[PDB]
Design an enzyme around this catalytic site. Structure first.
Site, PDB file in Angstrom:
ATOM      1  N   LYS A   1       0.836  -1.193   0.000  1.00  0.00           N
ATOM      2  CA  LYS A   1       0.000   0.000   0.000  1.00  0.00           C
ATOM      3  C   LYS A   1       0.875   1.250   0.000  1.00  0.00           C
ATOM      4  O   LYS A   1       0.720   2.131  -0.836  1.00  0.00           O
ATOM      5  CB  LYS A   1      -0.925  -0.021   1.225  1.00  0.00           C
ATOM      6  CG  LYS A   1      -1.872   1.193   1.391  1.00  0.00           C
ATOM      7  CD  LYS A   1      -1.191   2.413   1.997  1.00  0.00           C
ATOM      8  CE  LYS A   1      -2.255   3.389   2.594  1.00  0.00           C
ATOM      9  NZ  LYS A   1      -1.672   4.461   3.450  1.00  0.00           N
TER      10      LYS A   1
ATOM     11  N   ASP B   1      -6.161   0.309   0.488  1.00  0.00           N
ATOM     12  CA  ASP B   1      -6.211   0.594   1.921  1.00  0.00           C
ATOM     13  C   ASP B   1      -7.571   0.175   2.465  1.00  0.00           C
ATOM     14  O   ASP B   1      -8.343  -0.519   1.790  1.00  0.00           O
ATOM     15  CB  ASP B   1      -6.047   2.097   2.162  1.00  0.00           C
ATOM     16  CG  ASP B   1      -7.315   2.867   1.824  1.00  0.00           C
ATOM     17  OD1 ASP B   1      -7.894   2.595   0.752  1.00  0.00           O
ATOM     18  OD2 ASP B   1      -7.741   3.730   2.622  1.00  0.00           O
TER      19      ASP B   1
END
Ligand code: SF4
Ligand code: NA
Length: 213
Positions: A121, A139
């Site tokens: 991420k 996320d």
DNA sequence: AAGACATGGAC
DNA sequence: GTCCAGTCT
């Protein structure tokens, strides 16, 4: 799961709901972005922007972070949740930028992932926002929205979700779609109370219809 | 491979 | 007094 045309329909809608969606982390360069996103894990931007307001004032290069005592850095970002692991990760990260990447933030996604504290991420946000590299960072928001809307299955991993979007969305639109989804989930399809009643997707949303009924 | 990391805002 | 805002070992 929705059909491909439906998915694109959902995304095209989000695009109209949040045409100005962007990265909300305040940063003046790739390095400030890297640190900012690392502190952003399991934390809010408003909080992170407050802390870095002064942090980027005290530190401006990796040599600055590893110059002070670990205890000092921790104190400087103490209001950030998980500050201890983060403070430590930052120092090891800066040390590695110096030792391994000629003192600069690497532009490679996998290379960023070698840095302590940096997972997929984080690396994705960085290459996308800082170096225009197309990527879809997954996320809490992106995952929730994808699952609530039936973009993928509820059991899919973050990687699976990312692969689903890449397969659908054209490489040239990965970055912007990522922000639109973030905005959509942060300001609309919230975790606690989603604004289903007035959502342009309820007519094809599984979580939204169950929410109403 | 679940478990630990952890402050602060929104109710 | 819960719930929400990724990475590592
Ligand atoms: S219908 Fe509700 S749950 Fe579905 S995307 Fe819209 S706000 Fe999110
Ligand atoms: Na890493």
């Amino acid at each position: 799961m929705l059909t491909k045309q439906q998915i694109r329909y959902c995304l095209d809608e989000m695009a109209k709901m949040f045409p100005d969606a962007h990265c909300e982390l305040v940063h003046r360069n790739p390095f400030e972005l890297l640190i900012a996103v690392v502190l952003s894990a399991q934390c809010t931007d408003a909080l992170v922007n407050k802390v870095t307001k002064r942090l980027f004032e005290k530190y401006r290069t990796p040599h600055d972070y590893i110059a002070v005592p670990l205890e000092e850095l921790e104190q400087d970002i103490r209001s950030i949740g998980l500050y201890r692991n983060k403070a430590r990760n930052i120092q090891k990260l800066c040390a590695m930028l110096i030792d391994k990447y000629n003192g600069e933030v690497p532009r490679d996604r996998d290379e960023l992932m070698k840095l302590p504290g940096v997972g997929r991420k984080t690396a994705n946000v960085v290459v996308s926002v800082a170096f225009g590299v197309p990527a879809i960072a997954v996320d809490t928001h992106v995952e929730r929205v994808s699952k609530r809307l039936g973009f993928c299955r509820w059991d899919d991993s973050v990687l699976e979700v990312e692969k689903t979007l890449m397969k659908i969305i054209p490489k040239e639109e990965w970055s912007i779609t990522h922000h639109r989804m973030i905005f959509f989930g942060r300001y609309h399809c919230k975790a606690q109370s989603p604004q289903c009643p007035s959502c342009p997707l309820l007519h094809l949303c599984r979580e939204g219809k169950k929410r109403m009924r």
